Amino acid sequence: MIKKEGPGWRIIFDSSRDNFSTLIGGETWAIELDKSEWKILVEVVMELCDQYKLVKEQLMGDEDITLELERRPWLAILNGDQYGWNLRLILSASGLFNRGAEVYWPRHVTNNVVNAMRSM
Amino acid sequence: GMIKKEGPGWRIIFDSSRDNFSTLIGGETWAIELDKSEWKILVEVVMELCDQYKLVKEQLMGDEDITLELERRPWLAILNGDQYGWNLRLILSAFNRGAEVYWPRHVTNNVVNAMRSMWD
Ligand SMILES: [Cl-]
């Protein structure tokens, strides 16, 4: 199909699926997403990561930062320091099939995930 | 209202105000919401695997392991263990959103105990 992956993460797109055509995964979880959800997720994550990369330049030592960005149906929560960041994602439920979910990628793995998203 | 049970590495939550996705199951890095039909089957599948493992477990010597897989749509569950414990991989098929989740050794026993006692 169309697959990008590495230690602790994966992104898979399957065009034969008329609805849940994208899969995102971490080390112990994976969830399917519809085209709308996927589009908004990439937008949110790219913005939050861009915000983090710019602001991390003023962090002294092991000073931490927490950033959140919400764009329905997603709430993205970033926690990091000048050396890395983790990301918790809360997907609010919608309609009959779009169950809610909460997922998380740890420090360092996040950079690999956003690079994959960015290329897609 | 809400009934929640939680411990290191897991949680289960029932929210009586939700019309559809009224149950949440969680691991350390993930959570997914479930509808009542999915919850009922999940518990029956896990209880069936857990009981079978408990029997097999008394013939397991040293490092001897067992793998038990059970599919009862929409769930496919895979139990891997030895005489000291077991982990559990769950695949939830999509046409509700698909997902895959995992609980490690020792955590599984607590999850099972919570499943068995949700209403006491
Ligand atoms: Cl609902």
Experimental approach = X-ray
Q: How far apart are CA A117 and CA B74, in angstroms?
A: 29
Q: Do you find a cis peptide bond into A73, omega within 30 degrees of 0? A: yes
Q: Which two tokens stand for residue B54?
A: 């408990």
Contacts of B67 (CB under 8 A, 6+ apart): B78, B79, B80
Is B27 within 8 Å of A29 when comparing Cβ atoms?
Answer: yes
Cβ distance of B97 and A30 shorter than 8 Å: no
Length of chain B: 120
Instruction: Give the H/E segment covering residue A99.
Output: none
The length of chain A is 120
CA distance linking residue A36 with residue B15, whole number of Å: 27
> Reading across the β-sheet that carries A74-81, which strands appear in turn?
A65-71, A74-81, A84-91, A101-105, B30-34, B23-26, B10-15, B2-7
Residue A108 CA to ligand 1 center (angstroms) comes to 34
Asked if residue B91 lies in contact with residue A28, where contact means CB atoms within 8 angstroms, the answer is: no
* Geometric angle at alpha carbon A11, from A40 and A65, rounded to 5°: 60
Q: What single string gives the DSSP state of each residue in A14-48?
A: -TT-SS--EEEE-SSEEEEE-HHHHHHHHHHHHHH
* Distance linking the first and last C-alpha atoms of chain B: 15
**Residue A40 corresponds to which amino acid?**
I
Residues of B in contact with A102 (CB under 8 A): 26, 30-32
Domain A2-119, CATH number (from 3.30.70.1560, 2.30.31.10, 3.40.50.720, 1.10.1740.10): 2.30.31.10
The CATH label, of 2.30.31.10, 3.40.50.20, 3.30.70.600, 3.50.30.10, for the domain at B1-120 is 2.30.31.10
Amino acid at A112: N
State the Cα–Cα distance between residues A76 and B100, nearest whole angstrom.
20
- CB proximity under 8 Å: A 10-39 to B: 19-20, 23, 25-33
If contacts are CB pairs under 8 Å, which of residues 67-106 in chain A contact chain B? Answer: 93, 96-104, 106
- The distance of Cα B14 from the centroid of its chain, to the nearest Å, equals 15
Q: Is the backbone peptide bond immediately before B74 cis, with ω within 30 degrees of 0?
A: yes
How many other CB atoms are there within 10 angstroms of residue B57's CB atom? 16
- Ranges of each domain in chain A: 2-119
Write out A68-88 in H/E/C secondary structure.
EEEECCEEEEEEEECCEEEEE
Measured N-to-C along each axis, helices A35-55 and A109-119 cross at an angle, to the nearest 10 degrees, of 120
